[PDB]
Structures are given as structure tokens and as C-alpha cells.
Amino acid sequence: KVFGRCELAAAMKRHGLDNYRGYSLGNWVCAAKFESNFNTQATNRNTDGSTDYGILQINSRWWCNDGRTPGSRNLCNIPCSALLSSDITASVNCAKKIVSDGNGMNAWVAWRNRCKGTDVQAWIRGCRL
Ligand SMILES: CC(=O)N[C@@H]1[C@@H](O)[C@H](O)[C@@H](CO)O[C@@H]1O
Ligand SMILES: [Cl-]
Ligand SMILES: [Cl-]
Ligand SMILES: [Cl-]
Ligand SMILES: [Cl-]
Ligand code: NA
């Protein structure tokens, strides 16, 4: 599923991401925009053999199991394929664990590079919330 901007903002809010760990909703939408382009089926293979999955590009080295990342963890206790679903519940729950890990949203390098310090509220402007 390719989400609309305001549709994703609304689903992210309902799953409780708005101001999670102090990160306003626009931060999460911006991150999803640049990680996945709002596509829940997005995948990216990394040089270390791991793979990023889903609307928030959660990485198999630590957070999910895909059976092909040797010496990896599954801290969110899910199959990585659950992160590709049209329903973002697993992605949101796993993002809550990632962002609580000590480095906040810098865990998403696309967020640090492309969202941090910008006008992230613009990503939810004009949305019915
Ligand atoms: C939280 C998380 O797993 N982030 C990943 C991270 O591996 C990196 O920033 C990038 C690599 O392609 O994509 C994703 O954002
Ligand atoms: Cl915001
Ligand atoms: Cl594995
Ligand atoms: Cl959803
Ligand atoms: Cl923080
Ligand atoms: Na893993």
C-alpha cells in the first residue's frame, strides 16, 4: 500500500506515534516519506547483508527476523514480512522500540539527514487531525 500523506499521519496518530519520545507527528511522517516514500512494501538491501523493511525501513540486523541476516537479532520479535503489511501496526510498535533505544530518531539516518532541523510540521499541514 502506498499511503497518502494525511492518511498515514492519521494512522500514525491513532497508533500513538504523535509526540512519542517527544517526536512530533511531522517527524514520523517526514521519516516515512524519505525512508519508504509512504510505500509499506518498500525494501532495501544493505552492504552488510541486512535488509530494511516497510514504511519506516526497519532493519533485520536487530529488529526483525528474515532468516537471511546471520548473527542478527529480532528485538521486535516479528518476521520482517509483518513490516510490509498494509496495516502499519507492527511497524509502529517496532518503531517505538527503536526510538527508545538511546539515540532517538537518529536511528533513522534518512531522518537525521533530511528531516532533523527542518520544518517537519509542514508534513502534516492541511491534514484533518
Ligand atoms: C531504524 C533502522 O533500522 N533504520 C535503517 C538503518 O539501517 C539506516 O538508517 C538505513 C540503511 O539503508 O535505513 C533505515 O533507516
Ligand atoms: Cl509536527
Ligand atoms: Cl537471520
Ligand atoms: Cl494502518
Ligand atoms: Cl531524543
Ligand atoms: Na534479524
Of the candidates 7, 48, 52, 66, the residue annotated as catalytic is 52
Residues with CB under 5 Å of ion ligand 5 are: 104
Atom of ligand 1 lying closest to residue 59 CA: 3
Give ligand 1 pocket residues (Cβ under 6 A): 35, 44, 46, 52, 57-59, 98, 107-110
Question: What's the resolution in A?
Answer: 2.0
Catalytic annotation on 52?
A: yes
State the CATH class of domain 1-129: mainly alpha
Judged by its nearest atom, the ligand closest to the C-alpha of residue 60 is 6
Alpha carbons 77 and 39: distance in angstroms, whole number: 22
Cα 14 to ligand 2 centroid, rounded to whole Å:
15
Classify 112 as helix, strand or coil.
helix
Question: Which region, left, alpha or beta, applies to residue 102 given φ > 0 means left and ψ of -120 to 50 means alpha?
Answer: left
Q: How was this structure determined?
A: X-ray
- Alpha helix locations (H) across the chain? 5-14, 25-36, 89-99, 109-114
Q: Give me 19's grid cell.
A: 509526540
- Could you tell me how far CA 38 lies from the centroid of its own chain? 10
CB-facing half-sphere around the CA of 125: CA atoms within 13 A: 5
* Residue 119 among the catalytic residues: no
Closest CA to 12 of 49, 43, 56, 47: 56
Q: Which of 1, 2, 5 is nearest to 126 (CA)?
A: 5
Q: Which residue has the cell 491513532?
A: 14
With contact defined as beta carbons under 8 Å apart, do 38 and 56 qualify? Answer: no
Rounded to whole angstroms, the Cα distance separating 82 from 60 reads: 12
